[PDB]
Design a protein around this ligand. Structure first.
Ligand code: CA
Ligand code: CA
Ligand code: CA
Lengths: 218, 213, 212
């Protein structure tokens, strides 16, 4: 028999579980990309239609706040995790496992998957996330930091551009909205996303939140 | 331990040699990504060297007047009926094959592949009349890197025989090899001849298997 | 029959063994990073406190000799009776050890290695007479050089430096390179600068390459 994705019998990943157990529906399973001992398995969502292994961020969100003050009114990319007070870089997999173990489990998926993708949602109050309505351009768009020392941007090297799935942040309305970003690649080493650098921030009324989506490997 | 049959695949040919030194060179089933046995691939194992050799699909580019019109032209990216070379059991989904290859490419000590260019009135490497390799074809590897007659010596191919040096109205062939300790660079996925586009100028290609150690 | 680190039942690596048998103490174990066939397992030292997998050099040491007679000079490449350092069971073929090491890197977030330079009238790191490091030795990594200065990503750190002065006596300097990019290890060669007068001599203890 071939492991069925339970904690006692984790599969290698969700693709293997799909291949060997095509009866199983999308949901929560345990996978062990590094094989060997079963005890360091990680808990994931398996999309059984696509075969994707999806690992949630912990924590899932960055609360909505006035995170950055720069009263010189200068606008500049500022990394949330690297530079902001209360800042953290994004983390993935079972919080009860050692960080080193999670890093290796992710490394197996990042290095040896055919592709990967991840969405991230920026919650905005008076903060352009991508397009600025006044200008019609994306010069004020935020950046994302990948996992292979690379950045995902609105423009530039086309191998490194994200795409925007919706964009409700184009004007300062004094209200809350959101923009959803996605990076999709055949070089899964570049994922997951570990940081975000908003540009249109620093003013007294400028605020943001973040919902970090699961990194999904095929 | 695994015997290399379809129902019991070995991780790769090197393991199969190690664990069964009595087995002889031939067709076996290997499963580099391990885990579930069902996505195993069919390969040739050289049991003298331990190499895992995966055949291209399809095996070859048939001989013809492929191109009309001097510069490198990618067969797969730019020619009519052009296609890139792929590898592994065609009944398996492409993402699954990518993964099986990735395991071999990332984690082998070395890899090699031969390509044979069949030529009629087409220089492949050396031009006998000029005495240079400026008209030499190019190859496409798997990390978007090119293999060439010259340049960075980490990305140059070698030539094992060269019968394509003159236009003679007859058919001949030149055999190219890329060999590397950085196996992510292989397999070869496209070829760009240079000395083509004339009426009389025809070519074919035999794509050798990518062999991992 | 959960893998136990014996030759017949090797674990994948030291952390894997620690995870499956956390009562086990540090010492020598058989691990098999590439899995599949158990017969190409490698004998390693498992630090069971940290979970590190440590592979010894073979040979362990360069003996104390007047190695060079009158530039940085590579021990393995240029010196009479010199050799590059190698890792893993010598009775396993090189291509197989290469594979085991490739897997060990994948199973690792980070790696480290120490190397001890035994010196007589041979500056290793700091030169007392000049207050500077210009004469400091260099190490050859896998894939890449480790140096006293230059790019930060590639600088080693020094743990003791007793080689600062020509004293006529034997002393030693301890080097360490640590990185997330485990492809850069292990160390394969060593390049001392301050050699060799008739007086000048050295030896080396290559410490295990350690993966976590
Ligand atoms: Ca495991
Ligand atoms: Ca498999
Ligand atoms: Ca093995």
């Amino acid at each position: 028999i071939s492991p069925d994705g339970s904690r006692k019998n984790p599969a290698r990943n969700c693709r293997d579980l799909k291949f060997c157990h095509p009866e199983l529906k999308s949901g929560e399973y345990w996978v062990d990309p590094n094989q060997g001992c079963k005890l360091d398995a990680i808990k994931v969502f398996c999309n059984m239609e696509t075969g994707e292994t999806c690992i949630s961020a912990n924590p899932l969100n960055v609360p909505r706040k006035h995170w950055w003050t720069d009263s010189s009114a200068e606008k500049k990319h500022v990394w949330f995790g690297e530079s902001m007070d209360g800042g953290f870089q994004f983390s993935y997999g079972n919080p009860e496992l050692p960080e080193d173990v999670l890093d290796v489990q992710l490394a197996f998926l990042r290095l040896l998957s055919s592709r990967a993708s991840q969405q991230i949602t920026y919650h905005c109050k008076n903060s352009i996330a991508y397009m600025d309505q006044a200008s019609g351009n994306v010069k004020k768009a935020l950046k994302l930091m990948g996992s292979n020392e690379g950045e995902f941007k609105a423009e530039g090297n086309s191998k490194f551009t994200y795409t925007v799935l919706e964009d409700g942040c184009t004007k300062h309305t004094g209200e809350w909205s959101k923009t959803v970003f996605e990076y999709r690649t055949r070089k899964a080493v570049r994922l997951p996303i570990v940081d975000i650098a908003p540009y249109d921030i620093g003013g007294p009324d400028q605020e943001f939140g973040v919902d970090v989506g699961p990194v999904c490997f095929l």
